[PDB]
C-alpha cells in the first residue's frame, strides 16, 4: 500500500476570492505562491464561415 508521513497531504481549502485565501495563509504563517486566474478569451464563432466563397475557413466535410 501507499504510505505517507505528512499530515497535510489531503488538506485543500476553498475560498471565494484570492484575497481571502492570501489573508488566511498569512495569518497561519504559511509561505504561499499565488497563480492568477486563467479565463478563456472570448472567441468569434461564425457558422456561415464554414462555407466561405474565398477563405480557407471553408470546411471539406460536415
Amino acid at each position: 500500500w501507499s504510505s505517507t508521513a505528512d499530515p497535510l497531504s489531503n488538506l485543500v481549502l476553498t475560498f471565494s476570492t484570492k484575497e481571502d485565501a492570501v489573508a488566511f495563509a498569512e495569518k497561519n504563517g504559511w509561505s504561499f505562491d499565488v497563480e492568477e486566474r486563467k479565463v478563456p478569451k472570448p472567441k468569434s464563432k461564425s457558422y456561415g464561415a464554414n462555407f466561405s466563397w474565398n477563405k480557407r475557413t471553408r470546411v471539406s466535410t460536415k
Binding site: S52, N54, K55, R56, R58, S60
Partner: peptide, 8 residues
C-alpha cells in the same frame, strides 16, 4: 474565380 486554386 475565388482567387485561389482551392480552399487548401
Amino acid at each position: 474565380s475565388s482567387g485561389r486554386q482551392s480552399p487548401r
